[PDB]
Design an enzyme around this catalytic site. Structure first.
Site, mmCIF file in Angstrom:
data_model
loop_
_atom_site.group_PDB
_atom_site.id
_atom_site.type_symbol
_atom_site.label_atom_id
_atom_site.label_comp_id
_atom_site.label_asym_id
_atom_site.label_seq_id
_atom_site.Cartn_x
_atom_site.Cartn_y
_atom_site.Cartn_z
ATOM 1 N N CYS B 84 0.839 -1.191 0.000
ATOM 2 C CA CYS B 84 0.000 0.000 0.000
ATOM 3 C C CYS B 84 0.876 1.244 0.000
ATOM 4 O O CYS B 84 2.000 1.209 0.508
ATOM 5 C CB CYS B 84 -0.936 -0.003 1.209
ATOM 6 S SG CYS B 84 -1.690 1.593 1.584
ATOM 7 N N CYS B 97 -4.911 2.295 -9.571
ATOM 8 C CA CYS B 97 -5.060 3.210 -10.694
ATOM 9 C C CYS B 97 -4.749 2.494 -12.002
ATOM 10 O O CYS B 97 -3.818 1.689 -12.082
ATOM 11 C CB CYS B 97 -4.142 4.419 -10.528
ATOM 12 S SG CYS B 97 -4.521 5.801 -11.632
ATOM 13 N N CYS B 100 -1.626 5.267 -13.520
ATOM 14 C CA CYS B 100 -0.618 5.777 -12.603
ATOM 15 C C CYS B 100 -0.025 4.696 -11.711
ATOM 16 O O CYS B 100 1.033 4.919 -11.116
ATOM 17 C CB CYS B 100 -1.206 6.895 -11.739
ATOM 18 S SG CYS B 100 -2.179 6.325 -10.341
ATOM 19 N N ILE B 137 44.770 4.331 -11.160
ATOM 20 C CA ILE B 137 43.473 3.904 -11.663
ATOM 21 C C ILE B 137 42.512 5.074 -11.824
ATOM 22 O O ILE B 137 41.796 5.160 -12.828
ATOM 23 C CB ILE B 137 42.853 2.816 -10.758
ATOM 24 C CG1 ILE B 137 43.819 1.638 -10.604
ATOM 25 C CG2 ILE B 137 41.517 2.348 -11.313
ATOM 26 C CD1 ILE B 137 43.887 0.737 -11.818
ATOM 27 N N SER B 139 40.240 8.381 -9.399
ATOM 28 C CA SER B 139 39.935 9.102 -8.170
ATOM 29 C C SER B 139 38.427 9.049 -7.955
ATOM 30 O O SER B 139 37.717 8.271 -8.603
ATOM 31 C CB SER B 139 40.458 10.540 -8.231
ATOM 32 O OG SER B 139 40.041 11.280 -7.095
ATOM 33 N N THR B 144 41.174 6.476 -4.211
ATOM 34 C CA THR B 144 41.640 6.008 -5.509
ATOM 35 C C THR B 144 41.818 4.498 -5.457
ATOM 36 O O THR B 144 42.366 3.958 -4.494
ATOM 37 C CB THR B 144 42.957 6.687 -5.909
ATOM 38 O OG1 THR B 144 42.696 8.022 -6.362
ATOM 39 C CG2 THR B 144 43.676 5.897 -6.996
ATOM 40 N N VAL B 145 41.354 3.830 -6.505
ATOM 41 C CA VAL B 145 41.471 2.383 -6.637
ATOM 42 C C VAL B 145 42.917 2.024 -6.948
ATOM 43 O O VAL B 145 43.614 2.752 -7.665
ATOM 44 C CB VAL B 145 40.518 1.861 -7.730
ATOM 45 C CG1 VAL B 145 40.696 0.364 -7.939
ATOM 46 C CG2 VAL B 145 39.076 2.191 -7.378
ATOM 47 N N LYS B 157 42.588 0.940 -1.845
ATOM 48 C CA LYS B 157 42.201 2.338 -1.764
ATOM 49 C C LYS B 157 43.147 3.079 -0.829
ATOM 50 O O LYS B 157 43.948 2.474 -0.115
ATOM 51 C CB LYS B 157 40.753 2.489 -1.275
ATOM 52 C CG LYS B 157 39.718 2.494 -2.387
ATOM 53 C CD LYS B 157 39.512 1.096 -2.950
ATOM 54 C CE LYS B 157 38.344 1.046 -3.918
ATOM 55 N NZ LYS B 157 38.208 -0.295 -4.549
ATOM 56 N N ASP B 250 26.872 6.607 -0.122
ATOM 57 C CA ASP B 250 27.725 7.026 -1.228
ATOM 58 C C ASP B 250 27.200 6.511 -2.562
ATOM 59 O O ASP B 250 27.982 6.274 -3.489
ATOM 60 C CB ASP B 250 29.167 6.558 -1.022
ATOM 61 C CG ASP B 250 29.745 7.010 0.305
ATOM 62 O OD1 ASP B 250 29.834 8.235 0.529
ATOM 63 O OD2 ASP B 250 30.110 6.140 1.126
#
Ligand SMILES: CNS(=O)(=O)Nc1nccc(Cc2c(C)c3ccc(Oc4ncccn4)cc3oc2=O)c1F
Ligand SMILES: [Zn+2]
Ligand SMILES: [Zn+2]
Lengths: 224, 412, 293, 220
Positions: B84, B97, B100, B137, B139, B144-145, B157, B250
């Site tokens: 609901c 509806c 909608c 790699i 940012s 950073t990877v 990281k 994130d």
């Protein structure tokens, strides 16, 4: 009888029980008498959900068929022709119903165009389902006659005419593959709706706009 | 001549008269834009003071106005998970509806109650040395990877805290304990972390790219069959992440890395100890990274901890507005601080007119809910996942164009 | 009369640059300094990266070359930009004084005497930008005004690629914003915007204190709430002249109608009083930075 | 063949038409063959949905029945034929249970879920039956629920979904049918806490939310 039959529909409508309502409206309309407004839309919607549920189911079964051996393809095939047979039965009952009783006794012009749109709509359903060209041509004839009669009497913003135009455009697109003509008819219908959109009846106020929306969505989707 | 604006900033000058309300006069424009004059609101300014529709143009002459947004109900009995949307309960029988797709119960607008639903060490601190630091790699928001090479493919990281306190380090050992148990198919594997070097979050590495790359570099816009599947596989992953109360906080279009265009993976989340920098002994969170993917409350930062389970759902409304349109929101504002102040104050929200033509109107009440100014209104992730499951299979049913729908069928 | 030349440069490529050191840590981007074997002279290498469409970055790159006609002793010269490593390499004139963020954090405060000259320099540089190229700075910031120990001060990092103004707007995060309220409420009035952006910057230089937190840290959003909801700040008196207050006040008014145009900013008496007296700048920095000549 | 039958079942599963798969599920297990988890799950959902539609019709027509008399009496025979069809639907699957499913349950999780289904179906006929047979149906559901409820604790996890579902149905049984909200809430609470202390996942947390909300509305 008639009051009992419409009550057996008003009690089957709320309960989602649709086959009972289809079997009761058929009995109340084989009476050979006129169908006033209240039973009119009840019969229409009843058959509408009955055929449309099977149409939606057939759409999904066909989609799975497109999404795929010799047995996995085949099982979908028997189910799809079974739903095909049952939808053909349910649409044949109604088309024979209008031909025998409804259309010949259509006293009012709005009733005449309403039943003609119904007729063309079911033949559109059979056209999508399926020699094959006969059904599409007959649906075109029904739609053309309904449009021609509706061009005269009622106010150009009326829900029957508007839904007729929308259905007719859907016919041009999904069957005959005439998108230009589909957008043309839908466009003129919509603009004449704007032009004639003066003060309107409160009864049709909501439904007229509700169809006009879907008209706009067909225009917008068909622009690309 | 009473000029009035429109959504997407369109301009229309309605005639100035006396005795007839704005409803039917502006009705032409609102329907050319497809808006019913009963669900609209117009503004007169002497910021934006709303006014209704029953106002004569006699007093409105020479005034500029804005047009901004604020139902046929058949009966049905839902045959799968259907929640609901007025009480956010579980609904089994009730209205719906036609277009909608907003499902509700009459009671919530000797009674019955609810029922069953339709059903259907090994990990430890990564030591130094063996963790081969990756290469350049890229940012992002906070790091950073670094593609690690240790018995497989992993990522390394770096972070913005150099010498934190030991009590922060124990909180780190706790957060890894609560966060390494994220075993899912929508989340990449979490091998560990290396605290002997500069603090690192070790994750796996995924091929392909993220969603931001896919929809603003290649721009390989898909069909709704995949457009809804992506939101389904992301909602599932952010539901598993929400069950045990660990806010991703994130959710960005550039961290949802999907491989082979089939598998969807989500990572680079949390770290409430590295975030909320320990400049003293506090949890003062900082605003680092991009801005479009957090809510007005997160922009405000008016609370010590303004996050919630909801402010990870507005981060889904942005990632879904991104998927639908194909662009980012607020791509017209050639400014940065204007974006911050605007999304914070709430004077303006992402523009809904710019969505696609084949927009499923049922999701116009889902991705709109995902983007309210307020926070108590956007739905938690189980309802979003249910409402996406609903039309992930109800799409072939409406794969055609429109058609004449049924009648009102609602009595009160 | 200043003889600024840049024709000595040729083809520019990463293999032709050997790094030396770093100028410092900026807010949006990080500034480097590097050596080029053919040219020999030192460059100010501003490296920024933006994962954007290759067509868009190519659209920005050839537009960035207009700086070759935007030459003056008031604006930092442009050595040339090119694409490698996937980042935007904006080579600039390497000036030993850097900017006035290092001078702020070193000397603590700047006297009104230096402000008198730097105001003339900045106002005539921005007038040169506007009346010549029909585009304005849009980024009047203390950290974006490059200086050298040769007695000159110059501007840099204006709006040179319109597409890049927004391609950067989602990656330039910073923590300090002198952004003009007329550029905040939702409309653009650029003509009066840079005057506000310089009026706040000069207050920052004079007091050495971030003024939006009123003297008589705050969250990033709440700064803007202060800028665009309540009356603007005001420079302290006493240590700064009242005729200087008469200059700062007209540079920091919310409503652009009350904001005075550039021409008024040249008809003022204090602006013509600042150049009336002369200020030594060669030894001024050398007495507080340790550099020579 | 079993494969064809289950293929037809899941083809009808998304068809929004469930009577077809409900009828085919009868033929699937009328052989009495061993049941695996997935076919058992479709077995459960199909008749669950059929009784769901029938019960929704029951509720609405009961509403108009309680609304009022010339029109109201039509609702009465409408109601009774819906109830008759409903009763045959439940009785067919119950006869299936007491002939091929319950006496053929092998594993621990088989017995508990099938007993839960048997009790649930008996409860379904219980909402409608009145007079002398009503107490018989209610009693025949009592021990059916209890047999699985006692098996759950000793033979399977505190967090496994079937236990939470059984607790939920057992609890709601005490309220609407048994008119004993105290015993319902006192057991729902315990079923909530043993699982929450010992806290494939979405279904579990779903039932957990239903238990919390159900406790909430009983506390009212
Ligand atoms: C921050 N305010 S904003 O108006 O929203 N956006 C921006 N405003 C100004 C500027 C920018 C970005 C910007 C930078 C980074 C830049 C740096 C060096 C440069 O080259 C050069 N060479 C010689 C002399 C002066 N420059 C040209 C540059 O062009 C730019 O547009 C905004 F992104
Ligand atoms: Zn509700
Ligand atoms: Zn609606």
């Amino acid at each position: 009888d008639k009051n009992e039959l419409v009550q057996k529909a008003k009690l089957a409508e709320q309960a989602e029980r649709y086959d009972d309502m289809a079997a009761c409206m058929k009995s109340v309309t084989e009476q050979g008498a006129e169908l006033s407004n209240e039973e009119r839309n009840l019969l229409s919607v009843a058959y509408k959900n009955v055929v449309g549920a099977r149409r939606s189911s057939w759409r999904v079964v066909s989609s799975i068929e497109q999404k795929t051996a010799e047995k996995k393809q085949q099982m979908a095939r028997e189910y799809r022709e079974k739903i095909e047979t049952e939808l053909r039965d349910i649409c044949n009952d109604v088309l024979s119903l209008l031909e025998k009783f409804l259309i010949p006794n259509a006293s009012q012009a709005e009733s005449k165009v309403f039943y003609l749109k119904m007729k063309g709509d079911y033949y559109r359903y059979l056209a999508e389902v399926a020699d094959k060209k006969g059904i599409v041509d007959q649906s075109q004839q029904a739609y053309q006659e309904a449009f021609e009669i509706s061009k005269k009497e009622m106010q150009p913003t009326h829900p029957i005419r508007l839904g007729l135009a929308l259905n007719f455009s859907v016919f041009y697109y999904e069957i005959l593959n005439s998108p230009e003509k589909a957008c043309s008819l839908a466009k003129t219908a919509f603009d004449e709706a704007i032009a004639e959109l003066d003060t309107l009846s409160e009864e049709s106020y909501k439904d007229s706009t509700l169809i006009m929306q879907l008209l706009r969505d067909n225009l917008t989707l068909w622009t690309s | 001549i009473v000029r009035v604006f429109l959504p997407n900033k369109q301009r229309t000058v309605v005639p100035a008269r006396c005795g007839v309300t704005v409803r039917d006069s502006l009705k032409k424009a609102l329907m050319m834009r497809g808006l019913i004059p009963e669900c609209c609101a117009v503004y007169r300014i002497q910021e934006k003071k709303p006014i209704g529709w029953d106002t004569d143009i006699s007093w409105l002459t020479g005034e500029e106005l804005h047009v901004e947004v604020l139902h046929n109900f058949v009966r049905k009995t839902f045959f799968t998970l259907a929640f609901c949307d007025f009480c956010r309960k579980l609904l089994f029988q009730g209205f719906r509806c036609q277009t909608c797709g907003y499902k509700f119960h009459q009671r919530c607008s000797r009674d019955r109650s609810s029922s069953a639903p339709n059903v259907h060490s090994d990990d430890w601190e990564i030591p130094d040395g063996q963790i081969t630091v990756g290469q350049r790699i890229g940012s992002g928001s906070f790091g950073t990877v670094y593609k690690g090479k240790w018995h497989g493919d992993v990522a390394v990281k770096m972070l913005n805290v150099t010498a934190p306190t030991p009590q922060q380090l124990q909180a780190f050992k706790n957060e890894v304990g609560v966060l390494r148990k994220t075993r899912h198919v929508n989340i990449l594997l979490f091998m560990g972390y290396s605290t002997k070097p500069q603090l690192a979050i070790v994750t796996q590495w995924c091929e392909g790219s993220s969603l931001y790359h896919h929809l603003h570099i290649i721009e390989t816009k898909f069909e709704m069959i995949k457009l809804i599947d992506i939101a389904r596989q992301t909602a599932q992953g952010m539901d598993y992440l929400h069950a045990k109360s660990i806010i991703h906080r994130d959710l960005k279009s550039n961290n949802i890395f999907l491989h082979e265009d089939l598998t969807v993976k989500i990572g680079d989340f949390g770290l409430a100890t590295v975030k909320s920098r320990w400049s003293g002994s506090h949890q003062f969170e900082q605003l680092s990274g991009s801005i479009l993917w957090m809510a007005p409350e997160v922009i405000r930062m008016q609370d010590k901890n303004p996050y919630s389970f909801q402010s990870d759902v507005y981060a889904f409304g942005i990632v879904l507005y991104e998927l639908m349109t194909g662009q980012l929101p607020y791509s017209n504002i050639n400014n940065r601080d204007q974006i911050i102040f605007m999304v914070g104050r709430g004077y303006l929200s992402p523009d809904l007119s710019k969505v696609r033509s084949n927009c499923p109107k049922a999701m116009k009440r889902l991705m709109a809910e995902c983007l309210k100014k307020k926070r108590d209104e956007r739905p938690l992730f189980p309802q979003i996942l249910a409402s996406i499951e609903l039309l992930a299979r109800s799409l072939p049913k409406i794969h055609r164009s429109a058609s004449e729908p049924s009648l009102n069928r609602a009595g009160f | 009369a200043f003889l600024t030349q840049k024709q000595k440069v040729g083809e520019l490529k990463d293999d032709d640059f050997e790094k030396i050191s770093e100028l410092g840590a900026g807010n949006g981007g990080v500034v480097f300094k590097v050596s080029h074997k053919p040219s020999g002279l030192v460059m100010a290498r501003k490296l920024i990266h933006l994962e954007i469409k290759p067509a868009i970055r190519n659209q920005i790159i050839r537009e960035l070359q207009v700086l070759h006609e935007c030459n003056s002793p008031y604006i930092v010269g442009f050595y040339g930009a090119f694409y490698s490593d996937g980042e935007i390499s904006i080579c600039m004139e390497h000036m030993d004084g850097g900017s006035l963020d290092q001078v702020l954090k070193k000397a603590g405060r700047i006297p009104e005497q230096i402000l008198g000259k730097v105001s003339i320099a900045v106002i005539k540089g921005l007038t040169y930008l506007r009346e010549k190229h029909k585009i304005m700075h849009r980024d009047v910031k203390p950290s974006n005004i490059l200086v050298n120990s040769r007695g000159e001060i110059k501007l840099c990092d204006f709006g040179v690629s319109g597409q890049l103004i927004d391609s950067m707007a989602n990656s330039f995060v910073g923590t300090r914003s002198y952004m003009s309220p007329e550029r905040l409420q939702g409309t653009h009035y650029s003509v009066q915007s840079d005057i506000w952006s310089m009026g706040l910057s000069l207050v920052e230089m004079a007091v050495g204190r971030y003024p939006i937190p009123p003297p008589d840290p705050m969250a990033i959003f709440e700064l803007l709430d202060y800028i665009v909801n309540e009356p603007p700040p005001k420079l302290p008196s006493g240590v700064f002249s009242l005729e200087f207050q008469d200059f700062v006040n007209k540079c920091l008014i919310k409503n652009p109608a009350e904001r005075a145009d550039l021409k008024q900013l040249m008809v003022h008496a204090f602006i013509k009083r600042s150049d009336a007296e002369e200020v030594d700048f060669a030894g001024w920095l050398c007495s507080t930075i340790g550099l020579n000549q």
